[PDB]
A paper describes a structure:
CSDaV is a positive-sense, single-stranded RNA virus that belongs to the genus Marafivirus in the family Tymoviridae and has a monopartite genome of about 6.8 Kb. In brief, CSDaV encodes for three quasi-equivalent CPs that share amino acid (aa) sequences at the C-terminus but differ from each other at the N-terminus. The whole capsid models of the two types of particles are almost indistinguishable and reveals a T = 3 icosahedral symmetry that gives particles with a diameter of about 30 nm.
Besides the expression of free/non-fused heterologous proteins, we also demonstrated that the CSDaV infectious clone can be modified to incorporate heterologous protein into assembled virion capsids, just as it has been demonstrated for other plant virus-based vectors. This was demonstrated by fusing the GFP coding sequence to that for CPp21 in the full-length CSDaV infectious clone to generate the construct CS-GFPdupCS, referring to the fact that the GFP-coding sequence was inserted between two identical protease cleavage sites (CS) in frame with CPp21. When western blot analysis (using antibodies against both the GFP and CPp21 proteins) was performed on partially purified virions from the CS-GFPdupCS-infiltrated leaves, the free/cleaved GFP was not detected, but both fused GFP-CPp21 and free CPp21 proteins remained detectable, suggesting that the GFP-CPp21 fusion protein was incorporated into the CS-GFPdupCS-derived virions. However, northern blot analysis indicated that CS-GFPdupCS virions likely encapsidate the recombinant sgRNA (∼ 1.5 Kb) but not the recombinant genomic RNA (∼ 7.5 Kb), while WT-CSDaV virions show encapsidation of both genomic (∼ 6.8 Kb) and subgenomic RNAs (∼ 0.8 Kb). However, in this experiment, only approximately 22.5% of the screened CS-GFPdupCS particles were gold-labelled, indicating that the GFP-CPp21 fusion protein may not be abundantly incorporated into all of the particles and/or the GFP is not always displayed on the outside of the particles’ surface. In attempts to reveal where (if in the inside or outside) GFP is displayed on the GFP-recombinant CSDaV virions (CS-GFPdupCS), we have determined the cryo-EM structures of both the WT- and the CS-GFPdupCS-derived virions.
Residue numbers in the entry:
A (entry chain B), C (entry chain B), E (entry chain B): 21 to 195
B (entry chain C): 23 to 196
D (entry chain A), F (entry chain A): 24 to 196
The structure:
């Protein structure tokens, strides 16, 4: 799904020295005990905020949400509906298939490893910049919902992890 | 489908914006067989989207029968067809019309693009709203066969997504 | 009678495979018992509708109304006034000579066969298309009236029959 | 061009401009009265357009002419020109773009601002044709409840404009 | 399987206006209650006969027999043996694997959708013409047999449907 | 150019002009009522702009339409279009440039001078964008205390204009 292009701000510079910072952290681990929703804006992510707390500029080069199955999900698949939107749009709970590009993955079964449940962000349409001189309103936001399937409260059927690369530029001299 | 003659539209350079849309039609469990045939020109969600524009023509539409986790151990069968708005298929008889498909979603293969049915806008009519009321507008008709559902499992879900080009906004109520 | 030209819709295509379908059916048989009127739009004619019920496009190439006399009309001619109009205009009963091109035929007498009582349709001015993507409002409509001349209720002085050719294109896959 | 339109070949036909004007209705303040009409099938205009195959609006406007009886009692009517597809409800004509609320009468019977002209660049000028267009002009107006005397008729609504008629048909004389 | 070429009649014309008529109808629905055989010649198929009842010429351009599985066949596959022969050859019941090109499909199991159970007709070797000036004896004939696997008389394990395209030419003026 | 603006690359995107009109509020003379709203986050316009990423005003105006009940009792409202940064206080709308004092009703309900159009050459036309602009149009009007009957609603404030919407987003259908 390719969203139509929209006018965007122009940023001069982009020639300052900068380092690509690869980050990855498990978003959460989910079972089938209850349906659980989580929507997060990458501008205000706590771990990502503390990654770029000392730099003036920080823009994403790639980011993707990974729905990794576990062994306990071999005989009990679990369903997760996920979407990447702009920060302005805030999807509701369990209603991420109503937004264009929202996909409903089902992890488990005989195929315990597959790249069909990793949802990437189309940074050409979203806003790569997370921290800058001005606060942007169309930064990527990931919203997902996990449907209950009678889990036993501890098996942790699936794990949602988020990884990517953020380019950090222009450190500010504060301590 | 064989070609048919069609009317012509003059101004294709009018300011138009491509409007991607997606909305879940309904979630079905195999407790009872359920039919649904809808013309895209009169579907409630699409028409509340495009009631504010004078012209609205599709670029690509595709109905999707996405399996859920509960359908892993209990597949469900749906027969679907994309036809002309003049033709209204009956219940459970979507295989009697040319191009009708009989999808069966579920099982260990929980994800596959083989159950995605796209509309043939080359032969159908992309235009849903315009100066005239066409009769070749696409109609999607599907029937879900009962297989012993639990009335709460929601084995499958029906997702209709695509792109509609809207042009000439109207001074409507909102 | 040649009506002045009026602007008409433009239809692209017309290159799809199509078959000329020759049709002919007796419209009715009339005697002099009572004056009888009949006006019919060729778009909604039942026999013609079932001819083109499986095709997307159906346009006339020629059509004419034939007032054929019978033997019983040899010594008792009968009068029929007929007109071809657009579907918007609906002639009244026995008032088809007030519309431009309406003609009053008298069939019978020593000349029992003549082509002067066959009224053709000027499809250059009317709309040849009967079935298409859009419903047209100026398709041919034939309106005629039969005047009573003291018939004996069963002799069937004249027979009105309609024949023509309709080109059918773009079959639709329905059964 | 705001929106695409259906192609019409052979538009260079002999056509005549036909100015028309007719009073829509006279309204008093006894009760609120709504009226919405599509110019495609207006009863008192089709008689003008019955003799021709093509009718295309060049200009059209809705006029709210006050009467002298409205001097001591103003009357308010809300009107809008819209697409024939859109059918505004009663007293909701100010919620659509171009919808006005003409109040007439009052101390001075001179305000010539009661004209409500149709924006044919955002509408479909064609009223009659081979097909039945769905975006022809439609006028919708609602008259609010004044303290009317049930007989005064202290407001007048009229329609005037120009329609270009082409391709006459062999109709009744 | 490609049958060797055989001499065939020559037909002049083939330039008359003609429309491709796409047809599709479910042949039947079968379960495992009992073994059921069906052999049908496409020249005399009732639905196909009424499709081309008003045309002088009608020749196939493509046709295939589809063995579509159902949900109830997920845990209970069903076996169908099918063959396309000439109208002269009439296969017996449950003996379609003895004829060259006869294939034994098994529909069901974890793979509920596959194009390996759709058997097409080699119209280069068979006779595309179904209706013409003369009656041909080598028109396509489809013969299939469904083996019983202890079905419960109502589950309808599989559905056999037949779809194709027939070109219709030279309508005859009859009503 | 009155003042510098933020650069916006890729402005040649497919855009559609979206005329909008909605009645702001109906006011009686019972008590003085102030209302100042920024078009960047107006509740009844964001629903139009929620489905698109960029929204740029082409024209906008504030209209004070009198009602018939104002014939015998005029009502005065002071309004101004200003920078969203500036937030004029109550009854101080005539102290800013372009602030008008529309009095409506009176002997004649015909004065069409109640239009207050925004000067977009001195403002920021953009209502929605990647950033949150601080100089978008903001309309501020205060209605003074008449001798109202607390139910008459003898004045109406409406907003109409055109917004160019570009870059639709995959929002709800």
């Amino acid at each position: 799904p390719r969203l139509p292009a929209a006018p965007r701000v122009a940023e001069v510079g982009l020639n300052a020295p900068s380092v690509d910072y690869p980050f990855q952290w498990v978003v959460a681990s989910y079972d089938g005990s209850e349906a659980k929703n989580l929507s997060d804006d990458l501008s205000g992510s706590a771990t990502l905020t503390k990654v770029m707390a000392n730099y003036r500029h920080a823009e994403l080069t790639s980011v993707e949400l990974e729905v990794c199955p576990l062994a306990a999900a071999f005989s009990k698949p679990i369903s997760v509906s996920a979407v990447w939107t702009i920060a302005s749009i805030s999807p509701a709970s369990a209603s991420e298939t109503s937004y264009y590009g929202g996909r409903l993955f089902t992890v488990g079964g005989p195929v315990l490893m597959s790249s069909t449940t990793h949802l990437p962000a189309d940074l050409t349409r979203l806003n790569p910049v997370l921290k800058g001189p001005v606060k942007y309103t169309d930064c990527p936001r990931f919203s997902y919902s996990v449907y209950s399937n009678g889990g036993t409260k501890g098996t942790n059927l699936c794990t949602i992890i988020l990884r990517g690369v953020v380019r950090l530029s222009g450190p500010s001299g504060n301590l």
